[PDB]
Amino acid sequence: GFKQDIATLRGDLRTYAQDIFLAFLNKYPDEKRNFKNYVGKSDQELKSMAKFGDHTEKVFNLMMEVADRATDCVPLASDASTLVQMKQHSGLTTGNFEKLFVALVEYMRASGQSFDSQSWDRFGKNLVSALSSAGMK
Numbered sequence: 001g002f003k004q005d006i007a008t009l010r011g012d013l014r015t016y017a018q019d020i021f022l023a024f025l026n027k028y029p030d031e032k033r034n035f036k037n038y039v040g041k042s043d044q045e046l047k048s049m050a051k052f053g054d055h056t057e058k059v060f061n062l063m064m065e066v067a068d069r070a071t072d073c074v075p076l077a078s079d080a081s082t083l084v085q086m087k088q089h090s091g092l093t094t095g096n097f098e099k100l101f102v103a104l105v106e107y108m109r110a111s112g113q114s115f116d117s118q119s120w121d122r123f124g125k126n127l128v129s130a131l132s133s134a135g136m137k
């Protein structure tokens with residue numbers, strides 16, 4: 001289930017983080033706007049940019065912590081506040097996060113593996129709700 005899935009993702013985190021974040025940027029091309037330097041790049045080109053691998057892995061490092069500290073896929077309000085307040089997220093609306101989680105669930109559904117895609121979908125929804133509550137537009 002959810003907790004095992006955190007262990008699975010952490011076991012190959014660099015490759016899952018890149019592959020899910022590329023899935024997100026390819027499904028929702030307008031989202032590359034937040035990351036100007038990513039425009040006009042193939043997946044392979046992106047995977048060779050230092051910044052890409054480092055920000056993607058740090059996103060997933062913190063996403064897995066937030067998932068790990070959740071009760072029944074409901075994240076801590078303190079984690080939601082941290083995400084809303086980060087000055088790298090000044091731009092962002094819950095829609096940015098909704099789309100990331102749609103791509104993540106899709107990725108899990110398409111994978112050969114017994115990911116608990118329904119739990120991730122609930123986690124995404126509950127995070128978006130927690131982010132709204134903590135004051136994200």
Ligand code: HEM
Binds near residue numbers: 059092
């Ligand atoms: C659970 C979801 C997310 C987590 C845990 C998260 C976490 C982080 C972390 C830890 C950083 C600092 C990384 C660094 O600067 O090296 C960061 C930066 C950033 N995040 Fe997020 N993030 C999430 C979702 C999003 C989404 C959905 C977007 C945009 C659609 C986004 C856009 C950014 C941007 C633009 C930066 C800084 C720009 C840059 O790389 O120079 N984040 N995020």
Ligand SMILES: C=C(C)[C@@H]1CC=C(C)CC1
Binds near residue numbers: 021038052054056059
């Ligand atoms: C996978 C991508 C493009 C990453 C998303 C978020 C951050 C912080 C760095 C880039």
